[PDB]
Design an enzyme around this catalytic site. Structure first.
Site, mmCIF file in Angstrom:
data_model
loop_
_atom_site.group_PDB
_atom_site.id
_atom_site.type_symbol
_atom_site.label_atom_id
_atom_site.label_comp_id
_atom_site.label_asym_id
_atom_site.label_seq_id
_atom_site.Cartn_x
_atom_site.Cartn_y
_atom_site.Cartn_z
ATOM 1 N N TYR B 147 0.905 -1.182 -0.032
ATOM 2 C CA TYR B 147 -0.098 0.203 0.080
ATOM 3 C C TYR B 147 0.779 1.310 0.079
ATOM 4 O O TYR B 147 1.838 1.396 0.799
ATOM 5 C CB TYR B 147 -0.841 0.052 1.227
ATOM 6 C CG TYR B 147 -1.587 1.107 1.327
ATOM 7 C CD1 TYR B 147 -2.914 1.624 0.548
ATOM 8 C CD2 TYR B 147 -1.372 2.161 2.213
ATOM 9 C CE1 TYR B 147 -3.721 2.358 0.636
ATOM 10 C CE2 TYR B 147 -2.287 3.360 2.459
ATOM 11 C CZ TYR B 147 -3.337 3.427 1.538
ATOM 12 O OH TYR B 147 -4.163 4.523 1.754
ATOM 13 N N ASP B 235 9.149 3.271 0.286
ATOM 14 C CA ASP B 235 8.230 3.721 0.962
ATOM 15 C C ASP B 235 8.304 3.528 2.450
ATOM 16 O O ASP B 235 8.073 2.590 2.819
ATOM 17 C CB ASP B 235 6.788 3.406 0.350
ATOM 18 C CG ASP B 235 5.547 3.910 1.067
ATOM 19 O OD1 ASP B 235 5.674 4.335 2.295
ATOM 20 O OD2 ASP B 235 4.426 3.686 0.761
ATOM 21 N N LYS B 263 3.479 9.161 8.846
ATOM 22 C CA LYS B 263 3.191 8.500 10.121
ATOM 23 C C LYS B 263 3.741 8.944 11.375
ATOM 24 O O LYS B 263 3.629 9.905 12.182
ATOM 25 C CB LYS B 263 2.911 6.972 9.959
ATOM 26 C CG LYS B 263 1.877 6.695 8.868
ATOM 27 C CD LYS B 263 1.464 5.070 8.900
ATOM 28 C CE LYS B 263 0.338 4.952 7.980
ATOM 29 N NZ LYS B 263 0.558 4.303 6.570
#
Lengths: 433, 426
Positions: B147, B235, B263
């Site tokens: 993702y 990522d 995050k």
């Protein structure tokens, strides 16, 4: 003479760690003749203080979000409480429902809404949703209008009447640009032409119902009404990008102000109270395409977080005060009047577009009604003006395409000093050429 | 039964009327675990959640990844407050952006320069643009199941998309190959390598449960991709600062060309960032022709929050403690599975783990997808009843924080035993 010694040193260091020393090219002084951008250390109400301890009356409003002034205590309270109870859950909260309802109450055309993390994400989403809903691929937009920094909205015209786009940033493939048709804002004829030509492949048009990204520019009478007419005729949807406009001119969107209703709306900037946020909303059937309800995917780890919900709520609670937007309008009129008087006095050629508490001073004699005309205004003059205004203790946005924004905290006396400062700025321009 | 959700149910009913599906991320719907109203939370403190019905939970959700200092860590809370008092959004440069940039570079030396954005999704889409600008190529490669945010290109399952509203013109730019598989990787680069701008890699996968790269796999990715003239983007939106003070690239000792972050690095506030090799980053405006912007990018609240968070994470022994506690948790869960004859495999790295209902070792998306979602959903709801809040999907990780104690873990292990008993009982 004011000095920027600390800002200069900070910028020097910034260059080593951050590309061009800024986290948005808008913040660079490149457009206004170069030099170190000024670093701010604190804001309170209408005032900034830079790292050299200089004080400014601020009109930048962080490019649109700020309207209750810097660190309004009602929003600060809400942010503090939110932090004390955790700023980020990854679960539903009461605040999400509360804020959703408050946006729906202010903008009755939003049947349902979803929160995202930025205006950019909000726009990206409305596009995906319109494509899913219509089954179409192409998107129309108006020349010069800004819809965030996703690939699709980083596309320009359009070599010749009603054509496919070309990339307006490196890294954006022609395959992306091929999906976008750009036409001039405020032009019914070209809009008609493009829709006749591509209308059946267009999922949606994107509109800043009132433009804020090549200065403040209002739609002409009948224009938004005609966009709706033509676009619907074609089976396409209308997306109002209200990321600047919502809650800037009244308690509600430009769609409520101007009485024209889109199919989808993108929001952000003001509605977060200064914290990062986006939202989109519109007609029930359209929004129901979004997962988990529909097949159109949209998510976001910080989407609807408790801190942004809390600060957004607090901000709108401030904006609910009676007579608030009328005061912004009044002070705006005073400011407009004074700037125009100084320009006449010092034989400087300007045009000024204002709506309520937002305005743009253009260096030109043309009235600015579209991007093409804004492009051709005098960026060299604007740059010199910008630097002289800094010297006067007034912080503007460093681009001829930007707006001056008043906040609830600006006073008559702030405005009167600003006029004085403009007068001195214009005198200096007069004495140099 | 004993744990009631009446108020979450009434709230979900109201939310449905105003917010599509009643949530702002599909992740938060209980759709993957059998349906029902999701539990609405009222407050978080340290390792604990309280819902709107007053029920207390030990939390392993970590808001899907950013939470590692626990909810409302006082060091972060004070930074956010100070920032609010001093203005949270300026639209000018500030000393805090420079300070935080230096801290990231100090933790992750392969970042020559960094830029801040507002989400992991923005950080990812920017690295792609930059990769495309730098190489002059258009195709992007990625691994199946991974993702990378909710921008169009990464929502593609030439390839074909899995989100409605994503055009074929986008899908044609994407190539998707199985994680942890060298042969399919080489095969893809052989055909299409000359058109590929970059590969996107979760260097340690977090999005079909926790899954580590096989030995030598990341180095092979660098090898095959670089020889094709493409760039490697890590990522690290989940991985950075989760496993050590630094990225998976620092932990595993493999270096990409570009890195996306988010995050954890915001201390809870919205944030993203990206950086990498100096020459590549030179593409970004105002230095280069690749545009990237964002009104709240580098905002003083998110900057002060991120700095405060990394300051907490600098404490000696912190990541060791997370590893040790993770080990205890894994050990207890495996013992409970053996005792109650439940088939599971468990992937753990440090203080993050996923429990899969299966007998298979999980090394790629295909395997994870095959694990038993029905059994996971029952397990999830039994765990709520025991006062433990997990992420409501079999593809999720359990995340420990600095605030979880040996006692919290011990309690969780007994909760797991109680839940496994009910699964076996049936």
């Amino acid at each position: 003479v004011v000095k920027f010694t600390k800002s200069e040193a900070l910028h020097k260091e910034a260059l080593e760690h951050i590309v061009g020393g800024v986290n948005s090219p808008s913040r660079s002084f490149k457009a206004v003749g170069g030099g170190a951008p000024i670093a701010m250390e604190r804001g309170k109400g209408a005032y900034f203080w830079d790292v050299d301890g200089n004080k400014y009356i601020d009109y930048l409003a962080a490019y649109g979000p700020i309207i209750t002034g810097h660190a309004h205590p009602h929003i600060t309270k809400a942010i503090t409480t939110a932090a004390e109870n955790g700023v980020l859950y990854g679960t539903p909260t009461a605040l999400e429902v509360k804020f959703a309802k408050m946006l729906k109450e202010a903008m009755p055309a939003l049947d349902k809404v979803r929160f995202v993390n930025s205006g950019t994400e909000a726009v990206m989403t409305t596009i995906r949703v319109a494509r899913a809903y219509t089954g179409r691929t192409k998107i129309m937009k108006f020349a010069g209008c800004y819809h965030g920094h996703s690939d699709l909205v980083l596309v320009a015209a359009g070599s010749g009447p009603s054509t496919l786009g070309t990339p307006d940033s490196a890294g954006v493939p022609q395959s992306i640009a091929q999906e976008v048709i750009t036409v001039p804002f405020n032009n019914v004829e070209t809009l008609k032409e493009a829709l006749d030509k591509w209308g059946h492949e267009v999922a949606a048009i994107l509109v800043e119902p009132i433009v804020g990204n090549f200065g403040i520019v209002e739609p002409k009478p009948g224009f938004l009404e005609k966009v709706n007419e033509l676009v619907h005729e074609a089976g396409a949807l209308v997306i109002y990008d209200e990321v600047i406009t919502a809650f800037r001119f009244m308690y509600g969107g430009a769609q409520d102000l101007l009485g024209v209703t889109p199919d989808l709306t993108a929001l952000g900037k003001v509605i977060g109270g200064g914290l990062p946020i986006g939202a989109y909303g519109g007609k029930k059937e359209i929004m129901e395409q979004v997962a988990p309800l529909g097949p159109a995917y949209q998510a976001g780890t910080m989407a609807g977080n408790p801190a942004s919900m809390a600060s957004g709520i607090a901000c709108l609670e401030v904006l609910q005060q009676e007579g608030l937007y009328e005061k912004l309008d009044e002070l705006g009129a005073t400011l407009e009047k004074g700037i125009l008087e100084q320009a006449a006095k010092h034989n400087i050629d300007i045009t000024l577009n204002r709506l309520k508490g937002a305005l743009t001073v253009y260096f030109t004699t043309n009235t600015i009604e579209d991007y093409d005309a804004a492009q051709d205004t005098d960026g060299e003059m604007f740059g010199k003006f910008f630097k002289l205004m800094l010297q006067e203790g007034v912080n503007l946005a460093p681009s001829k395409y930007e707006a001056w924004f008043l906040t609830t905290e600006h006073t008559k006396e702030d405005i009167e000093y600003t006029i004085e400062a403009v007068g001195r700025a214009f005198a200096a321009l007069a004495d140099n050429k």
